[PDB]
Amino acid sequence: GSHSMRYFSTSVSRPGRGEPRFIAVGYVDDTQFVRFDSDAASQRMEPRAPWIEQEGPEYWDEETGKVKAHSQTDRENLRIALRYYNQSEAGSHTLQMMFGCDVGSDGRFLRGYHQYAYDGKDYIALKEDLRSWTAADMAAQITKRKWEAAHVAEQQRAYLEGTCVDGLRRYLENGKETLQRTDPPKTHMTHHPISDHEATLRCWALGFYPAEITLTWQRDGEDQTQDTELVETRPAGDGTFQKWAAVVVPSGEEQRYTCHVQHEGLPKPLTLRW
């Protein structure tokens, strides 16, 4: 199916306690593969997945340069945004950036992303056409003008459509045995009496990949609405993911309930009964 590549950088100012801390992480789909922490001693983009280790000194140099270069511009962007907003140098501010590209089933370009957030809210973003910018506010509009006069756009568009999808194609091939595997969920149900007239039913989905999954409870084939409790899909810590839905059930009624799990890695969607 479709795939993605993403970079997530975050700078935080530590006023009176040194220079800002820059952290950047890289993902193909739901699989991190690189990192750069400015408070690290390597001072280099480091690998975080096996299939990226096979990249040569040339690659690591290039990527190290671009992230280190970014960290520096960011640290000066935190300064500029203090001026733009007339903010106090006593307060700590955050500057996030996400960048990446979506591709289709055979590796064609679908969408490109380059956008920013100041203190957790939208700052400036590249519209879908990769031709224009959207500015969240008056400050971001100053930088919208600067990137317009600088013609940043036509550079980002060429990179996203080419280099970015070319790179994703490559990673998907080098990380083939992993980035394209589809692990189905290990499913099962539990039972917890809460107070003699009520018992929680809990449906489980474990060790699957990718993270996209649907858990559906039912009472006589009738979807429940939030009498059920979903938990946010969580990372197992080993490349796979987990999730569970629960319902509170009137004692003796347990068997009226069914669980319904849909996942890419399944042939047919499973249904479970206590």
Binding site: G26, K66, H70, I80, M97, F99, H114, K146, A150, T163
Partner: peptide, 8 residues
């Protein structure tokens, strides 16, 4: 492949 970045 890490992106290029620009000043605000």
């Amino acid at each position: 492949r890490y992106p290029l970045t620009f000043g605000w």
